């Protein structure tokens, strides 16, 4: 009938919440345009050059 007052103690052993690896941002064309505030309607218009027919 011995009772011992002991503390519950919390440990960290490396069990983390499994999460995905991030790969998409490095594969996509990023920021060829930046001056969206500075252009009308927050829109930068990109020009596609002409092609002629003979």
């Amino acid at each position: 009938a011995h009772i011992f007052v002991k503390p519950e103690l919390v440990a960290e052993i490396g069990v983390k919440q499994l999460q995905r690896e991030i790969v998409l941002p490095g594969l996509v064309w990023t920021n060829p345009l930046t001056d969206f505030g500075g252009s009308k309607n927050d829109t930068i218009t990109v020009r596609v050059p002409a092609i002629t027919t003979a």
């Binding site: 009308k40 309607n41 927050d42 829109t43």
Partner: protein
Amino acid sequence: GLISDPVEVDPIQVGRDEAGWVQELRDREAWPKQEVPEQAKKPAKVGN
């Protein structure tokens, strides 16, 4: 208006929507796959 009033509509937002260059996509979770939205099929503008 008032400073405490709810935020009103941005004219830049209205013009941005009326220009029609905001990218609409498909839900990526809808089965069967969605039809391609009309904005996603619009030809390039002849002018600017």
